[PDB]
Write a protein that binds this DNA or RNA. Structure first.
Lengths: 97, 95, 82, 106, 95, 109, 80, 98
DNA sequence: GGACATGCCCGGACATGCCCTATATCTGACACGTGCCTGGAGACTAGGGAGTAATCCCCTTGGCGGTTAAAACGCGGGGGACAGCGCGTACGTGCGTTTAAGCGGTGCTAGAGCTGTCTACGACCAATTGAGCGGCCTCGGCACCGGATTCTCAGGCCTGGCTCG
DNA sequence: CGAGCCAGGCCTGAGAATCCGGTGCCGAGGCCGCTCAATTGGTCGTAGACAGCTCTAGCACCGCTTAAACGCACGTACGCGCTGTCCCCCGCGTTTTAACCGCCAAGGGGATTACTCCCTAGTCTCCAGGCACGTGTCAGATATAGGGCATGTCCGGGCATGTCC
């Protein structure tokens, strides 16, 4: 049957998700993760709805920015595929690693 | 009946002054309130430090003006200083 | 006690995050590092948030606690209080 | 009759409210009369500029109500506002539709 | 005879003689120590003030100081500092 | 009248409780100030000074040097992970940099 | 004027050497000059603003310390 | 034939020499002339304290050393050794200065 | 050498889904009316911090020189920057499934939020003196220069085995 | 078998770390005098700890639906490795030049001290507009439908080199 060339659909998804604004990370697994981490610092924590939404907005913005920088370093290296070493370089140069 | 602090009516008046045809959503209004509060905190804090460094215990317009010049970019600083000076002169004359 | 919910941070979700960041191609090996990175982020934020919660003689984390924690880490967030 | 300083000055932000927030923040032991007027005027200027750009962006989108997306476009498209808010994340703002030239097809 | 300029030189020297009886200190190094101590002071006092403000607290106490120390210092440093502070404050209160 | 004895001595500390208290009071931080805040501050500053001086002394003796110089202070801060983290955005005058060569720059056989 | 050439080629080489680089392209020098000049512009701007607010005519070391502090890099050893 | 080291040996020797010591590497007076010229574009007839120029110079050398460290790391990431302008531009773009 | 006919390549002619444009519904979220009461506005008092004048000396600016380490330039070269090609392998893309994400409704009680009292805690002022800061001496740890020394390294002489006549 | 020329190994010729040593030097540590602010003492405002009540939504549960994750199959585009090229920067040598220390004049303004003055905290009293609450109402989310075109694909015209007379 019909099959799209590698690359057209990736670009289509990039345009689609950069045009709109809905959250892309699932709410419930994020909340569950938050509860697991909270459990190891202080017992039986309760979290506001707007608090979990705040953590999710912050996390998604941080990851989007990190992936932007990773893509820029990869293309700088005449690459398109992102590698773990790309993530590590981006985080080291940003000064958090 | 818990009184809060917001600039909603004043932001709406300025908006009607500049564009008396456009509304504003709750999220956008929250972003505007966060923005105005942030700018306020930044400018007031810089003015306070400026005053402390020069052994001044009173907040007057010269330190405010210098802080504005430090924080705002070129054209923004020039227009803000011009508007502030005209407004303060009109108020002082009007008493 | 919730256990092994780390597998809930799915591969396609990370792919969508990368799409929003302008990434065209993503290695399969990226995801675990990203998961680790995400975990690290949480570990800092929650420590500050719960600390504020604990200082105020509260045991429920509030939106204001989170916004202050994010601000004091330089990643100030708008939309949940000033 | 009582007439406020903002009314005498022709400004929209309240001189009294800005005065109370400056006084009660534990910033200084005395406060001048012109400082909150000046501050209100600068805040007005910046609000007018941001709403101007956001309205423009909304009209370009054939929208009559400004949304957070339009605010993000306004802040990120303006070089000086973007500089002022370089370390600011606006919720529900998204990002600019910016695609690197090398990633485009040949 | 110039104006009174405050510094911590003698206290740093006393602590040094407590910890290293036979070690000296240069003027440049003392300046680095003064910058360090003043910086930590500014950070802790500012964070404590902000903490107290956030909770509608008008009085500076020891709990906010302790929490600020725990926020700014790493793990074992925070634990050791807290232990020293509590022992010292309770011993002082005994007098 | 009772004999005057200092608060630092009462606390077993070397940093001046009175002086730190005056600088805290006059730093425009709050209208009201507790008695235990300057005690905590003096204790933390003395502890941090003691740790930095330990590391700097170690470095000085490793160099057979008897006086602490800025170079030794820079080495001491950077050689401890937690001090380096705390002072990540601090430049020490006359401190230099760590001796460190990337593996790829070394010659090969 | 012509003072930009006073940051001489061997000087940029030495600064780069302390940074741990082994080889330095010929086009590096102009880039370094531009970056340094912009940095100086921002620092000196802040310093002169502080000097003028204090009604002074000479830039002091403390003015520079404040400029550097507000720029995001605190420098120890010249007061404060 | 006169003695000649292979390319690199002297580079490593100078790396060790300048990383071991701390004396300033940029000339004082040319920097001073540059600073006054640049400053004069903002305010005329401005004066400078000696310790002010020394502070500015220490800051400048620390900044350049750090930028060159990051540039070298980015170059090595690209399996390269020689630094080029695009490396400087990448380092400054990722640091957020551009 | 001239004519012929086609192989092949690149620039115009094409059936599916993605983008774009039009429109009905509603609905809940945005815009507007109200009470009041607590903060904003008008007014008097005080005092202390800010505005202004005279000094000085010290801290900066200005100038000559020498001479030497640093700067500018010439030039060999080799190793690293850069272009080109193979590959295979891990990643883009399509499809069924289940797995859980997301929405609607209710529990209710732990926990966030508002108010009452007052007593410990801290602001505020007089006298004091002892710790804390400015000025001076000095000598010892540090800075500058000469001296012998070894070491990982290079080069020349001697030995040994391969090859040709 | 005798002569030849070199590969290779081992025992003397070498630019930086090993200190090793000496001498000067200048500034930090100690001492002393002055001085100003922390103490001690007391009094009085005040505010937040603790109780107590209220009331909001967080957590858990249940239910359902449906978009998304995951595993697999398959094609494929480039990261890495390899090879070749070249160019242009490192290292050394030569000439230059101003950096830096030395020394000395001069002026101007930062800071100090004193005098004055006026501006806002504080308090009092009255009033007005901003915020829960409530309510009307309308622009975008949701949904469906229709036009038009990008795209992997096909076809015709032009170019090029092979072959025959």
């Amino acid at each position: 049957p019909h099959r799209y060339r590698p690359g057209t659909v990736a670009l289509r998804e990039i345009r689609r998700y950069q045009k709109s604004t809905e959250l892309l990370i699932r709410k419930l697994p994020f909340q569950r993760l938050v509860r697991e981490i909270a459990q190891d610092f202080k017992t039986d924590l309760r979290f506001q709805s707007s608090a979990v939404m705040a953590l999710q907005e912050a996390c998604e913005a941080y990851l989007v920015g990190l992936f932007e920088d990773t893509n820029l370093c990869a293309i700088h290296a005449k690459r398109v595929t992102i590698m773990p070493k790309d993530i590590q370089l981006a985080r080291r140069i940003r000064g958090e690693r | 009946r818990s009184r809060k602090e917001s600039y909603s009516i004043y932001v709406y008046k300025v908006l009607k002054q500049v564009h008396p045809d456009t509304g504003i959503s709750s999220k956008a209004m929250g972003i505007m309130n966060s923005f105005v509060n942030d700018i306020f905190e930044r400018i007031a804090g810089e003015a306070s430090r400026l005053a402390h460094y020069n052994k001044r215990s009173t907040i007057t317009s010269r330190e405010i003006q210098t802080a504005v010049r430090l924080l705002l970019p070129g054209e923004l600083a020039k227009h803000a200083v011009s508007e502030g000076t005209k407004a303060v002169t009109k108020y002082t004359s009007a008493k | 006690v919730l256990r092994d919910n780390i597998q809930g941070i799915t591969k396609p979700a990370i792919r969508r995050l990368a799409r929003r960041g302008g990434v065209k191609r993503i290695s399969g090996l990226i995801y675990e590092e990203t998961r680790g990175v995400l975990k690290v982020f949480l570990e800092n934020v929650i420590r500050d948030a719960v600390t504020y919660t604990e200082h105020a003689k509260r045991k429920t984390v509030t939106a204001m606690d989170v916004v202050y924690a994010l601000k004091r880490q330089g990643r100030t967030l708008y939309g949940f209080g000033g | 009759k009582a007439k406020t300083r903002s009314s005498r000055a022709g400004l929209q932000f309240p001189v009294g409210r800005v005065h109370r927030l400056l006084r009660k923040g534990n910033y200084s032991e005395r406060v001048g009369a012109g400082a909150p007027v000046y501050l209100a005027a600068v805040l007005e200027y910046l609000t007018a500029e941001i709403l101007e750009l956001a309205g423009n962006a909304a009209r370009d989108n054939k929208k009559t109500r400004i949304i957070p997306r339009h605010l993000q476009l306004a802040i990120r498209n303006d070089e000086e506002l973007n500089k002022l808010l370089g370390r600011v994340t606006i919720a529900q703002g998204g990002v600019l539709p910016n695609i690197q030239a090398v990633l485009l097809p040949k």
